[PDB]
Structure formats: C-alpha cells, structure tokens
Amino acid sequence: MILVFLGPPGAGKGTQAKRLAKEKGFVHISTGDILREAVQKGTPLGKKAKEYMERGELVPDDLIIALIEEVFPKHGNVIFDGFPRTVKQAEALDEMLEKKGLKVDHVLLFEVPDEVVIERLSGRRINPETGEVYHVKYNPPPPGVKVIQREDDKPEVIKKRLEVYREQTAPLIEYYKKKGILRIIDASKPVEEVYRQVLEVI
C-alpha cells in the first residue's frame, strides 16, 4: 500500500514514518535523498536536475516524478514523507502511479496547533562551538555554556513560516479530501498515542 505523510515542521511525522516502515516493511521515501543520489551519480536525470539548480531554478516537477519512478520498489509498498508539496505534484504522482495500476491509499495529515509548533521550534538553542542543539524548555544547556537562538527560530519567523506552509498546503489537502483519502491525525498527543492513530487508519 501507498501512504503520504504531510505535516508542518515540528509535527514529528518522520518519526512515525520510520517506525511504521520498520514494523510493516515499507520503503520510506524522502525526495531529498533520491535527488541527491541521482545528481551525485550523474545519471541522465541527475545531470538535468543539476543544470536547473546551478541556474537558481527549482527542479521541475516532472523531473522529481521521473526520479521517483526510477527507484520505485517493485512490491509497491512505500511511505512518501513530506511529498507531494503541491497540487501539481499530487496530480503528476497520481498519474505515474496508475501507470503501474497503483494508487495512494491513505494520506495522513499530522495536525498540531501553531502554539505547540512555536514552542517546539522557537525553544531551540545552539552551541555555535560544536553545533550541538538544546531547548530552553525541553533540554536546557548548562548554565555557562554559550548558546544562541537562530534567527529562524524566533516566534515571528516561525509564525510567518506556518502561514506559508498553509498557503501552499491547503489546496493539496482539499484535493485529497475530494478523493476521500485524507485522514486527520492529532499529532499533539504523546508519541505512542499518535502511532495508535496511524495504525488505526491503516
């Protein structure tokens, strides 16, 4: 079966993805990985994707689709983690899948209140003399170790970032809602209870 896992950063969706992959025997797919490998190996699509990045352009959607179609497991059990990102990608993904007589079975939307995402992300502190990460609330640094707060983790910026995430994702969500395949997960819950919801929907 094929699953898509979507959610903003801070939602913990990849932890859920990796556990399910391990227990059930899915291939976990991050498009970042497949792209990086193709570009490094210098395959024909790897080379084409590369020219685009060098110019300052996004890699076109049909290229990412073709990269996925290349390394796609024969058994057809995969979890897409954070992809598609747009409606356009969703349409092209659907198209290449049905070319194999396969479909997306479930899309899991990991929902979590803005308030909680801000607390998770904004709380982060970095030792710039190692790069070792801490959290003012969850895992405080020793009083004494020098730590900073990345500009990006300021509540202002994160707020902006969720707003952009929603603008981009709303139409994706609606597209999957229209097909009757969107399952809502309450990701505000303890990790074991989130995993319970995922198992329930599948």
UniProtKB/Swiss-Prot annotation:
EC number in record: 2.7.4.3
Origin superkingdom: Bacteria
Keywords: ATP-binding, Cytoplasm, Kinase, Nucleotide biosynthesis, Nucleotide-binding, Transferase
Start and end residues of each stretch annotated as LID: 123-153
GO terms under biological process: AMP salvage; nucleoside diphosphate metabolic process; nucleoside monophosphate metabolic process
Localization terms from the record: Cytoplasm
InterPro entries documented for this protein: Adenyl_kin_sub (IPR006259), Adenylat/UMP-CMP_kin (IPR000850), Adenylat_kinase_CS (IPR033690), ADK_active_lid_dom_sf (IPR036193), P-loop_NTPase (IPR027417)
Catalytic EC class: transferase
UniProt binding sites for AMP: 31, 57-59, 82-85, 89, 161
Pathway annotation from the record: Purine metabolism; AMP biosynthesis via salvage pathway; AMP from ADP: step 1/1
PANTHER family, A to Z: NUCLEOTIDE KINASE
HAMAP family: Adenylate_kinase_Adk
Name recorded for this polypeptide: Adenylate kinase
